[PDB]
């Protein structure tokens, strides 16, 4: 079966989440689980997919940085990607992937991440948006610009952050199931962001 | 005589698109189809031609890219080409056609395909229009830039997606003439769009 | 001595338009037919000269990019020159006069061509108008920009179009004769459309 | 466990900044020290998290710069860590905290400082603000762009900074101690003003 | 004593400007006539000396260019220099009084101008302005960004260009010192255009 | 010991201004120079300094400029710098000097002089400001942005100017305490522009 089967999260609205992380190795066919997503974007999510992405540091001085990880989310799923060091040729589906012009493609604060996965990877997203900008510009509040995930999510939801700062606070010790349910939780919230700022 | 004789599909309103694809060799003459573009263009189309590029995905960085298929699309006209790696002398046409003032080309989130295709093509669209943007300004919509090429047809024609959201939901799994009905549907969605854009 | 004595086009409002074609070896006189434009320029044009451009596209992909002819178009002419590849120093006067200050460069559709001639050829244009973006300005009509010719003085000046839509509607059945025509024609409009907007 | 037992600095608002300056070696552990400042900033700062960083010159013309210090302040701490010649491993802490997205970083005067920690070490904080632009716009007061840390607290706060001016105004014959509150009053300082601009 | 030696003009509003040439070789010193341009300009000119360029074309294929000749001038004065290829130290001092931030440097269409300058000469103009381009602004009048030198002066002090008109329309057939005339002309209406955009 | 003991000269209101000129060579110590400007600065100063700098040019086209006068000032002093070439490691406490973000340092017409120094000697103005621009945006006047040092104070401060329009406008034959004299004059003037604006 290829059906998101990891632990599932409950949210603040009653709603819960999915899993499906991957340790990618260099023939594991992950275009499956990207259809999922796609399919759940266009049909629950509104054709939005918010994502993340997680670099390996490195040694142009930022060309050693490595995509270590990618998260997608839309209305029902989220995909953990935890990329080889290097790619291998089954990453080809991830290219393509991001390449589509079906979705847009929602993130938060990605400028530098995007120059990154074009010089350090050739992955181009055709389709983005950082977040922030349309966030405090709609709003004519250019504060938003320059907010992080969990505090984005504040001042667009008020949704109670309490949990997702309990396990932020104390990122160090927590386990990589806590790690998972704030990037599910995120993963979530980011989607409720866009939802608000372009159905409105 | 030179003639679209592919399948017909059609839209939400009893018209019918004329179809052909060509596997571009190194002695074809695809001449006669782009000329048959220009032409339908011109007489009945208020000079705008709707594309979309699609690459061939690669391994400095963005090198991997490879133009694989064009598509150009007119009121009563879609044209699909699939092209080879490395093109022919052939093309050249192709070249020169994008290259034109006569129309107007009008694209969906081709920021970064415009420049991969300048740069690894040489495939110069003198006149070309990321036509998003537009959307956003005269509609006075921020998120209409940022959509991909369902979505701004969505919001800016609310016309029945019905048949697009089913094939675009299962896409690995549609047939070659579900996916060509989905271009299809695409190309005329945005020749509407545009027809309604530049008008307003 | 020197005249446009080629074929000479009458315009839908009556005027006229001389013409010249000179097909530039590489060691031919282009000087004389320069004067004239910008003597028609200056006394009966007030400094508006109107262009286009034609490119050989050779297989940095754009280093292949020759010039092959230009288009300059006034009041009461239109100056053809076909150009050799390579050039010789016989041409060193259209450099000289496109990057004249004494006049502008009214161009349609030309950042693209600026880079190429800069670029490619070392031509440089020092006083150039990409005319779409003042006339979208201009008068409050954001779609300017981005039509190609016929479009913008369309949206314009609402002139007599049939003749030169029914002619690029077949462009590739068009003798170079009246492919003439149809430059001579949107050189025109194009003057008229630039002496409308420096008023505005 | 983890604690700041380097001195504390009363501000002039009765409250008291905890300091520790850590040297950092080839195989010091500093996560316990940046595990505890997001925790703080979470918990207790609104996951701001100001900053600034060392520059010694050395003799790309810049290639000479070498990060040798670098502070991260939220209300309650102030860390200092000072970074060793060779950047071993253990310095991957350091990078991946100045890239989170659990936090952001606020630094005043920063535009050269990131541009340079990105050509020098390939460090691109993610989420950063040069506040001194927000505070002008924010204020409309253009001119708050372009002050230093303390004519910048002067002209948003108003408070008393005599002791602060009495430190900066004999830079040079200050000691440690002296050169720790400096900083460490602007750490404080800066933390107060993104709390008083992110919701005005 | 140096001194402006050569012919004077009227000019259509009853004043005069006196001029001077040189051809530059090696051995000339030009500082006298600088000092002269520069207290004319400090003590009549309000600081704003109106200087134009000139190019000696050759086959970055625009390197080949050599800065042909400069022209500088004010109310009362004009200097010619016709450059050398190579230069020779006694070159420093033009690139000396460029630098200087006594007084604005104004010319028409310097875009490309200042680029070739710095790319092959290393002749940086400091404290340079494109008159047309404030002009515009100043104005409501978004095309006056793009005119040529003649208009520019037409359409923002409307007076008598027949003269200047007459010469520029027959340029070639017009001498050594017909050509000073049109330049010494050149400058007048320029300095009289910085002079309305002084004070608006 | 060190203080500024070379001429001292009146203002406009009566106060003065207190010089210093160091001829820099591989071991001159401008140490306690650096540091009293520091200070003038911090205590009486409004938490910047002016400057100035100027280059000797020498034959990338631009390598040739080597920084060879510093001009540095404040409320009560000129500190003026004449460095050698190549700089020695005494430059080590000039390159930390304009690191600090202690004080704002003001110029005019800086920009290209913000180039070069990074280009041609790696030195980095973080807190840096080109003066001319905030006063265009605050004094409402279009042109203040492209004046020089003399006419931007002319033209904020009305102020009298006979003074250095004298020594300005024969520059030729001023001698070296006299063109200290005008290097302090525009010193002073911009420090007062500095003031204004500040308020602004």
Same mark, same amino acid.
């Given at each position: 079966s290829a059906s998101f089967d990891g632990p599932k999260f409950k949210m603040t609205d009653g709603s819960y989440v999915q899993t499906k992380t991957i340790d990618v190795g260099?023939?594991?066919?992950?275009s499956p689980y990207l259809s999922l997503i796609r399919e759940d974007s266009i049909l629950?999510?509104?054709?939005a997919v918010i994502f993340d992405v997680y670099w390996d540091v490195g040694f142009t &001085?930022?060309?050693?940085?490595? *995509?270590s990880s990618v998260k997608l989310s839309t209305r029902n799923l989220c995909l953990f990607l935890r990329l080889? &060091?290097?790619?291998?040729?089954? *990453?080809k589906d991830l290219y393509r992937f991001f390449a589509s012009k079906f979705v847009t493609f929602v993130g938060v604060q990605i400028e530098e991440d995007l120059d990154l996965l074009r010089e350090?990877?050739?992955?181009?997203?055709r389709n983005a948006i950082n977040v922030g900008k349309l966030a405090a510009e709609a709003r004519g509040t250019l504060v938003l610009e320059f907010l992080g995930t969990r505090e984005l999510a504040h001042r667009v939801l008020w949704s109670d952050l309490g949990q997702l700062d309990s396990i932020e606070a104390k990122w160090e010790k927590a386990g990589p199931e806590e790690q998972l349910e704030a990037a599910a939780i995120e993963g979530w919230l980011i989607v409720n962001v866009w939802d608000q700022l372009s159905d409105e």
């Open positions: 260099s023939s594991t066919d992950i629950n999510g509104n054709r &001085k930022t060309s050693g940085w490595s *995509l080889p &060091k290097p790619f291998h040729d089954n *990453l350090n990877h050739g992955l181009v997203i």
